[PDB]
Structure formats: structure tokens, C-alpha cells
Amino acid sequence: SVLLSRELHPVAPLLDNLISALNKVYQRKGVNISMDISPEISFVGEQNDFVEVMGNVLDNACKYCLEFVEISARQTDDHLHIFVEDDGPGIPHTLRPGQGVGLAVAREITEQYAGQIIASDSLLGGARMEVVFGRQHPTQKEE
């Protein structure tokens, strides 16, 4: 029958822009953001959604971090994993929240993509947020 490839969007370039904007927003605080994502990593789906989810998670990380934020990523045939770590307060054993309070938007959108957001401890000392997006198969049937 009819099989179509789906639109893939390279991740690094998308995060690059978000990072530049946040760097300016939190420059007085002096936030240092680094990203190590291979050019191969991509996202399948509405580009605006990925940008909206990551914009929220990165902004949150800048607020809770002390001065460092690190971004990384990994993919699996059907999932895209984005990791955002900070050196802020730990997580629910100061301490802060895996802050689902202001990650309501990120959680909503990720839910759409059959994914989820998980909080764990980072080596930097703060939270390590994993944003998982599902429905990442590169092809699908329909016109």
C-alpha cells in the first residue's frame, strides 16, 4: 500500500538557537550552557513541538542551576532521548523540584508523542532531566 517517509529535523541546530536566547536571558546570573549532540541526532514530528518542549526544559534548567547546564542526547529506533543536566539543588530525596510545576507544558506535549519526562540525579550536583519522545519511526503508511 502507500508508505511515506516522515519529516526528520536535525536536533543540534534547533537547540543551538534556544541556547543563544537563554544565554542572553540569564547572562546576569552567569549561566554556562554546553551541548554535545552529534549532527546525526534528529527529531521526527512537528518541529515547533520539539522547540516548545525543549525551550521549557532548558529554561527551567537555567532557573534551577547555579551556573552550569549540560545537554546531551541519544536515539533508539523509536525514541529520542534528550538529557538536560544542571548543577543546582538536588531532587526530592535546598533541594528543588524535578520541577514538574513549570514543566507542565513539556509534559503535555511529550505525552502527545507517546513519551515522558523523567528526573534523576546529575553528576553536576543537580537534576538530570530526561525528555523522551516516542513515535520516532522514520516511516508510516497513509498517502
UniProtKB/Swiss-Prot annotation:
Every copy of the Histidine kinase domain together lies at 2-137
Q: Where found in the cell?
A: Cell inner membrane
Among the GO molecular function terms of this UniProt record, one is: phosphoprotein phosphatase activity
The residues that hold ATP are 56-64, 86-91, 94-103
Q: What induces it?
A: The phoP/phoQ operon is positively autoregulated by both PhoP and PhoQ in a Mg(2+)-dependent manner. Repressed by RcsB via sigma factor RpoS.
- Give the record's subunit note: Homodimer; probably dimerizes via the cytoplasmic domain. Interacts with MgrB in the periplasm, altering its activity and that of downstream effector PhoP.
Q: What further note is attached to this protein's record?
A: The PhoP/PhoQ-signaling cascade, which activates virulence membrane genes (pagC, pagO, pagD, pagK, pgtE and phoN), is induced by cationic antimicrobial peptides (CAMP) (polymyxin, alpha-helical peptide C18G and sheet peptide protegrin-1) at sublethal concentrations.
**Name of the protein this chain belongs to:** Virulence sensor histidine kinase PhoQ
Instruction: State the species of origin.
Output: Salmonella typhimurium (strain SL1344)
In the UniProt record, what gene is named as encoding this protein?
phoQ
